[PDB]
């Protein structure tokens, strides 16, 4: 139960388990387990090395883990270096997509900094 | 020689026809146990019969339009109790004592201005 150089839960339905891969959600999970004709309800523990490989193959079709994490980080570095409004939202650590800040906005800003 | 009631509860209306027979029931071209999943519903529909043991001595036929389940179920009961005390002007008094003959009336209250519902009114904290 090692895919994309990470350990996958072996007591979880393949569908659920494959999601542990960063860069596969649930849509991809479903696809994989059909593109690589493997059943959904099957737990990973009760497979063949063979099954696990054809599976290993499907996942390689996507960009995932390390690879992905790099892509994202480029995209954000790209913005900040451009210095666009969207860039600075990322710098100053503020809602990048137009959300109000007068109130709320605590997910970017993090927990409260009292006064004085 | 078939005996008839109408019957209403909340937003439901139930037109019913009874006939002498062995104890069949149809609702909207369907059987009792099919049309009504909930058990309560069934109890309600037959309890006028279960009262005056004609449960299997008359054969009923029904249609309902409007309302939800407990509405229709209720509306039917009223429908029967009407017909069943028309086939027999006799039974009324017994039927009536069970409180089946009265039409419920309880309707949903309107929404009013200033309120979140009929009577629920928005909070204001003295906190």
């Amino acid at each position: 139960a090692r895919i994309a150089g990470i350990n996958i839960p072996d007591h979880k339905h393949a569908v659920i388990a494959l999601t542990s891969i960063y860069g596969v959600g649930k849509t991809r999970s479903k696809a994989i387990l059909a593109a690589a004709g493997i059943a959904e309800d099957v737990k990973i523990s009760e497979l063949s090395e063979g099954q696990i490989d054809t599976l290993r193959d499907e996942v390689a079709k996507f960009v995932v883990e390390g690879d992905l994490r790099r892509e994202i980080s480029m995209s954000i570095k790209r913005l900040m270096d451009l210095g666009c409004y969207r860039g600075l939202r990322h710098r100053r650590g503020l809602p990048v997509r137009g959300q109000r800040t007068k109130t709320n906005a605590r997910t970017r800003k993090g927990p409260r900094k009292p006064i004085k | 020689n078939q005996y008839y009631g109408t019957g209403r509860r909340k937003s439901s209306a139930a037109r019913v026809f009874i006939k002498p027979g062995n104890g069949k029931i149809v609702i909207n071209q369907r059987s009792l146990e099919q049309y009504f999943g909930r058990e309560t519903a069934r109890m309600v529909v037959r309890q006028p019969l279960e009262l005056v043991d004609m449960v299997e001595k008359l054969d009923l036929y029904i249609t309902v339009k409007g309302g939800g389940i407990s509405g229709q179920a209720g509306a039917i009961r009223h429908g029967i109790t009407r017909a069943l005390m028309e086939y027999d002007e006799s039974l009324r008094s017994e039927l009536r004592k069970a409180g089946f003959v009265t039409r419920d009336a309880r309707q949903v209250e309107r929404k009013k201005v200033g309120l979140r519902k009929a009577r629920r009114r928005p909070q204001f904290s003295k906190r």
């Binding site: - | 909930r38 058990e39 309560t40 069934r42 109890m43 309600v44 409180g99």
Partner: protein, 155 residues
């Protein structure tokens, strides 16, 4: 209220066991208007009560109910700076309502998987003087016994 409330309601009896008593018990467990959901949870508990006591259902669920009904409760009353707890008889219908409430309250506060399990276990434990439900009654009774001196005030 200051006047008298006129017009008591009509609980229809249970579809199965045809009891107004059990019908009340459902309402009390019922949440957010979901009467069917509650109707299920209740029967599945009694099954599993019946399947161990082997003593019917409308006669087993009772035995739980007797182990837990209180007979004397305390009312609070402000006297000087202090507050007098004072013992009072309980009305029959009230001690039904309390037993049924305490059973439900005790059920929910458990770690079992289903709701049905929690209810079942609780009803069983009730029948053998055990659970939180029955603990509560004991405590109520302790308090009224303690400050018995204030039995006859009318104040």
């Amino acid at each position: 209220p200051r006047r008298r409330v006129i017009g008591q309601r009509k609980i229809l009896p249970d579809p199965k066991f045809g009891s107004e008593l059990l019908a009340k018990f459902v309402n009390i467990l019922m949440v957010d208007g979901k009467k069917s959901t509650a109707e299920s949870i209740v029967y599945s508990a009694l099954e599993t009560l019946a399947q161990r006591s082997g003593k019917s259902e409308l006669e087993a669920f009772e035995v739980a109910l007797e182990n837990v009904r209180p007979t004397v409760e305390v009312k609070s009353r402000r006297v000087g700076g202090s507050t007098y707890q004072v013992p009072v008889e309980v009305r029959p219908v009230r001690r039904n309502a309390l037993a049924m409430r305490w059973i439900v309250e005790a059920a929910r506060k458990r770690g079992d998987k289903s709701m049905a399990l929690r209810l079942a276990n609780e009803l069983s434990d009730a029948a053998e003087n055990k659970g939180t439900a029955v603990k509560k009654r004991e405590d109520v009774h302790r308090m009224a016994e303690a400050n018995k001196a204030f039995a006859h005030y009318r104040w």
